[PDB]
Design a protein around this ligand. Sequence first.
Ligand code: QUS
Lengths: 256, 58, 64
Amino acid sequence: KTVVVTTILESPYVMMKKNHEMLEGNERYEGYCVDLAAEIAKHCGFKYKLTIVGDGKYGARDADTKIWNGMVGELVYGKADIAIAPLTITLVREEVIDFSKPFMSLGISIMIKKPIESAEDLSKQTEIAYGTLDSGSTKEFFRRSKIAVFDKMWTYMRSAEPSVFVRTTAEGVARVRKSKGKYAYLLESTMNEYIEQRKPCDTMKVGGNLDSKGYGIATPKGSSLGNAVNLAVLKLNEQGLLDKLKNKWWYDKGEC
Amino acid sequence: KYGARDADTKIWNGMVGELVYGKADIAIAPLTITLVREEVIDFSKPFMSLGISIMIKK
Amino acid sequence: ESTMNEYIEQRKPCDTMKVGGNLDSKGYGIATPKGSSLGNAVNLAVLKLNEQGLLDKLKNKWWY
Ligand SMILES: N[C@@H](Cn1oc(=O)[nH]c1=O)C(=O)O
């Protein structure tokens, strides 16, 4: 009956409300995806329960145990009925789960502490270290690129010691902030743009996006919800709600 | 034409109509994914991102 | 659409230009009739091409 929604504590998509300990259920959270979940649920006619993914990961298949972790795993093993999060539509995921059309368009980008202007720049040097989220579509983009500059970047990143990979986006952001310009972070343009509008306003997005892709609402392969969820995403985009929500969470409340 | 539904006859024209009435098996073109179309035909994930814009003479 | 606009902007007589930002954000998709045997495979093929970098390659080829 009640749809279990798996999501991730990733700002500004889902965050704990300042007074969450005094609130119950869905009311404990706020964010772009919290606002989107309420709307998808109204338009699809279902009751839901927001739950934060237990391992705090997006979703990758372990080469070895072949088990899917993160939000993708929760859907694959039936622990959740739908994922409403900044989950990237990728070929490997689409093979095991269904995705609505994109609710947000984006691409990999470079985040620097306020002398690097591009991925080519990062590749040609070694003083400034750089990495990605330890588990996610960004790390996979590099591990599989056949493009020279990106393959060179991957060769470096995968062998860098200490590790240049981070467990969460917040961790990558803090590393950039505390490294005196000696660490650049590769992350999705959406997260980059958000952080650029957050105090202490010491980071910046540089260069163009490395690729073009989108985030989609995910459901277990063959779910009853897929069709309606997809139609809802298309309707909300055409009406302008998605743009409204991005403005609300990225720029209207910007601190810089 | 790309494809729109006649308000009167409810008949689809353009590439959309060709798919709807079985004249073509697939449309590979700059065909925009929309709610009205998604109701009558299937669309793959996007191969290109875009938005409406304004073209002016310099 | 921004796509046609920016293409024309880079073609003689070079007398037009795109002004302002896009009014919305959407995408183009390969379409098939409802229940088509091709639907599933074409969708996965689009995802493969984007990830291989082929779509960006074709875009630069025909625009830039
Ligand atoms: N949305 C990404 C997670 N992730 O966020 C980034 O900024 N990079 C990255 O891999 C995914 O779905 O795997």
